[PDB]
UniProtKB/Swiss-Prot annotation, chain B:
<feature type="region of interest" description="Disordered">
    <location>
        <begin position="26"/>
        <end position="42"/>
    </location>
</feature>
<feature type="glycosylation site" description="O-linked (HexNAc...) serine; by host">
    <location>
        <position position="32"/>
    </location>
</feature>
<feature type="disulfide bond">
    <location>
        <begin position="245"/>
        <end position="297"/>
    </location>
</feature>
<feature type="glycosylation site" description="N-linked (GlcNAc...) (complex) asparagine; by host">
    <location>
        <position position="50"/>
    </location>
</feature>
<feature type="region of interest" description="Immunodominant HLA epitope recognized by the CD8+; called NF9 peptide">
    <location>
        <begin position="155"/>
        <end position="163"/>
    </location>
</feature>
<feature type="region of interest" description="Receptor-binding motif; binding to human ACE2">
    <location>
        <begin position="144"/>
        <end position="215"/>
    </location>
</feature>
<comment type="subunit">
    <text>Binds to host ACE2. RBD also interacts with the N-linked glycan on 'Asn-90' of ACE2. Cleavage of S generates a polybasic C-terminal sequence on S1 that binds to host Neuropilin-1 (NRP1) and Neuropilin-2 (NRP2) receptors. Interacts with host integrin alpha-5/beta-1 (ITGA5:ITGB1) and with ACE2 in complex with integrin alpha-5/beta-1 (ITGA5:ITGB1). May interact via cytoplasmic c-terminus with M protein. May interact (via N-terminus) with host bilirubin and biliverdin, thereby preventing antibody binding to the SARS-CoV-2 spike NTD via an allosteric mechanism.</text>
</comment>
<feature type="glycosylation site" description="N-linked (GlcNAc...) (complex) asparagine; by host">
    <location>
        <position position="323"/>
    </location>
</feature>
<feature type="disulfide bond">
    <location>
        <begin position="43"/>
        <end position="68"/>
    </location>
</feature>
<feature type="region of interest" description="Integrin-binding motif;">
    <location>
        <begin position="110"/>
        <end position="112"/>
    </location>
</feature>
<feature type="disulfide bond">
    <location>
        <begin position="187"/>
        <end position="195"/>
    </location>
</feature>
<feature type="glycosylation site" description="N-linked (GlcNAc...) (hybrid) asparagine; by host">
    <location>
        <position position="310"/>
    </location>
</feature>
<feature type="glycosylation site" description="O-linked (GalNAc) threonine; by host">
    <location>
        <position position="30"/>
    </location>
</feature>
<comment type="function">
    <text>Attaches the virion to the cell membrane by interacting with host receptor, initiating the infection. The major receptor is host ACE2. When S2/S2' has been cleaved, binding to the receptor triggers direct fusion at the cell membrane. When S2/S2' has not been cleaved, binding to the receptor results in internalization of the virus by endocytosis using host TFRC and GRM2 and leading to fusion of the virion membrane with the host endosomal membrane. Alternatively, may use NRP1/NRP2 and integrin as entry receptors.</text>
</comment>
<feature type="region of interest" description="Disordered">
    <location>
        <begin position="162"/>
        <end position="197"/>
    </location>
</feature>
<feature type="glycosylation site" description="N-linked (GlcNAc...) (complex) asparagine; by host">
    <location>
        <position position="38"/>
    </location>
</feature>
<protein>
    <recommendedName>
        <fullName>Spike protein S1</fullName>
    </recommendedName>
</protein>
Length: 251, 328, 49, 97
């Protein structure tokens, strides 16, 4: 709990290049076969995204949320179980917590005492957090079924999410497609919008533990985290009302 | 006469031989479509109003109302209520409004205490037990409890505080049993010299005078923040007309035009969408999932072909961009 | 485009803002839309020449 | 008028209407004594179930604050260039030139 495991060590800031990806539907309006111009928070094309991995090391450092988050994970068994957002990441204030039980995503904003590197066994909090109290907010997603067991073949789970807080409005853009690099271009879709209204300056991630303190072994997954900037893109809408292309006004 | 239309547009009583554009033919709207989304996911507002139990003046229990549909229409169109009075809004106007946060408490008061619950009220009750704040935007509703909250010879199961060491603020629940101390003689938790006993049991009985009788008071506290409104009240809608020129009144949309079957796909989180012109070309039904194509009502230009008024008054009307079938 | 007005939709202006504020905003849109058409006629007369 | 039109126990001679079936148009007086009827229960000319008495009385008292202080309101409506103007301040006049 309070002792760092073998997977925690100083590591170099590796990064990759995201070229096309990072475009999403800026609004809920419908448009087809038109050229639309909009300025919002987007991931610049041909940018530098910080690269992370999990397997003799585990990457879950405290990451500033200031400019937003573009999270893209390449996985089979859905290793990453959720996210942790908040300012101090302690019981002094309220923090957002996202836990995926592989049935219904549980989203709760509350006062949590967070450890340095939260883990999930079944879920066990702690290790994630020791105590919780004094909160009125709770939320749940729709019922579903997902398999957390190991899978074979290629990497069939690519989950690319955009996490942003706009005037207290926390929105989640979601996309899932089969596929150490992603390629291709597709526009993300809106999923969750919660008027939480908290200040999130930093964030972490959750891991799924498997075993036949250090007895639990980390899974095998890779991902990276980008940031958003207020840039103007031209979105290409097709006859079906989807984005097949995007052009960066200044690149 | 279309001949006179040529005179008014030209601002002359002599029209020379030629063709002149006068006005533009258009189809005016007939009916009006009013659509409102369903009231489904109604909210437990009966946990106070119809609740079997209740609380004292200072023990008042609050029920959180958020992310749900609160239907007061049955009550306001009926109103089996003792007295309903409040400031800034009429209670009958609370069922058409959407609010971010809503709170509904439950407590019973004596008949003489009806005036004690008002925004910014002061007295032996308002100040020492419960009262509405000066900025209170909600409304309070009394109800006659003589058939429920009462009891034979009185109700002694709940007590009220006569005195308090300090003035209590609005919207504050103090269950403290602390004894009031008027002088410098320590009370030692009990009444005595320079000490008063603030707690008193309710006399509520159906047979006593109007002065003291159980009256259930539910204070509805409404708060509208910058966040979207998670609690809306009920509203009635009308039917939907198609293939006819009519006015559009929707939840987030208003306009005029005709509705037709739309072949365009839409997202589950979108209601309506815009065309190249930033003008809505389609809308989704609020109650059911469907999309209809919005088209403007038929129209066309009107030109008059007439010879010189000094020659003949014969008139010929040209409808441009309109086939003879759509002229009527 | 709003032509300086709070919004480019008239129904929103009239249905929300008060009559004295609505008339002002509606005048800004009408004023500009007449200028846009004014520039159009000017260009057509040039091309017509 | 808190010095004049108020009263220790209050002056209810002046009254006001809290209820009406719709919005009262401007420059229109409502003398209607009809009891406001919310539901289908006939009121029989008195308040009761689904029946409410619109007219009420002012709170005027000398002891309380502004809300209890009566004010005498006189609203002037001028007709300007709607007909020959026969009224205006003590303005002089001169001979034609």
């Amino acid at each position: 709990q309070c002792v760092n495991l073998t997977t925690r060590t100083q590591l170099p800031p590796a990064y990759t290049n995201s070229f096309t990806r990072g475009v999403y539907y800026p609004d809920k309006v419908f448009r087809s076969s038109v050229l639309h111009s909009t300025q919002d928070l987007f991931l610049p094309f041909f940018s530098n995204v910080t690269w992370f991995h999990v397997i003799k090391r585990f990457d879950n450092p405290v990451l500033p949320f200031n400019d937003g988050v573009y999270f893209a994970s390449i996985e089979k068994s859905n290793i990453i179980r959720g996210w942790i957002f908040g300012t101090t990441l302690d019981s002094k204030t309220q923090s957002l917590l996202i836990v995926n039980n592989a049935t219904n995503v549980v989203i709760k904003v509350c006062e949590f005492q967070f450890c340095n590197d939260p883990f999930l066994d079944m879920e066990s909090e702690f290790r994630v957090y020791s105590s919780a109290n004094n909160c009125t907010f709770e939320y749940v997603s729709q019922p579903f079924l997902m398999d957390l067991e190991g899978k074979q073949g290629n990497f069939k789970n690519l989950r690319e999410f955009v996490f942003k807080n706009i005037d207290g409005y926390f929105k989640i853009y979601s996309k899932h497609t089969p596929i150490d690099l992603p390629q291709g271009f597709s526009a993300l879709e809106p999923l969750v919008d919660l008027p939480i209204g908290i200040n999130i300056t930093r964030f972490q991630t959750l891991l799924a533990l498997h075993r036949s303190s250090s007895g639990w072994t980390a899974g095998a997954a890779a991902y990276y985290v980008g940031y958003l900037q207020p840039r103007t893109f031209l979105l290409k809408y097709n006859e079906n009302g989807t984005i097949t292309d995007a052009v960066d006004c200044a690149l | 006469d279309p001949l006179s239309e040529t005179k008014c547009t030209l601002k002359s009583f002599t029209v020379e031989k030629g063709i002149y554009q006068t006005s533009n033919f258009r189809v005016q709207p007939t009916e009006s479509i009013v659509r409102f989304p369903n009231i489904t996911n109604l909210c437990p507002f009966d946990e106070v109003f119809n609740a079997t139990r209740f609380a004292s003046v200072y023990a008042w229990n609050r029920k959180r109302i958020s992310n749900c549909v609160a239907d007061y229409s049955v009550l306001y169109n009926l109103a089996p209520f003792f007295t309903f009075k409040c400031y800034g809004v009429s209670p009958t106007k609370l069922n058409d409004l959407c609010f971010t946060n809503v709170y509904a408490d439950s407590f019973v008061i004596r008949g003489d205490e009806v005036r004690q619950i008002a925004p910014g009220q002061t007295g032996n009750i308002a100040d020492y037990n419960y009262k509405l704040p000066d900025d209170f935007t909600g409304c309070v509703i009394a109800w006659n409890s003589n058939k429920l909250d009462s009891k034979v010879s009185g109700n002694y199961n709940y007590l009220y505080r006569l005195f308090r060491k300090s003035n209590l603020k609005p919207f504050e629940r103090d269950i403290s049993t602390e004894i009031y101390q008027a002088g410098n003689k320590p009370c030692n938790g009990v009444a005595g010299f320079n000490c008063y006993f603030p707690l008193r049991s309710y006399s509520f009985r159906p047979t006593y005078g109007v002065g003291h009788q159980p009256y259930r008071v539910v204070v509805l506290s409404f708060e509208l923040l910058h966040a979207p409104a998670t609690v809306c009240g009920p509203k009635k809608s009308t039917n939907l007309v198609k293939n006819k020129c009519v006015n559009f009144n929707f939840n987030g949309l208003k306009g005029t035009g005709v509705l037709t079957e739309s072949n365009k796909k839409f997202l589950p989180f979108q209601q309506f969408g815009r065309d190249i012109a930033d003008t809505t070309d389609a809308v989704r039904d609020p109650q059911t999932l469907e999309i209809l194509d919005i088209t403007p009502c038929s129209f066309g230009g009107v030109s008059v072909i007439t010879p010189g008024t000094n020659t003949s008054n014969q008139v010929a009307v040209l409808y441009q961009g309109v086939n003879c079938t759509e002229v009527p | 485009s709003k032509f300086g007005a709070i919004s480019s939709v008239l129904n929103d202006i009239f249905s929300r803002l008060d009559p004295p504020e609505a008339e002002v905003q509606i005048d800004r849109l009408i004023t500009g839309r007449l200028q846009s058409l004014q520039t159009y006629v000017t260009q057509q007369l040039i091309r017509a020449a």
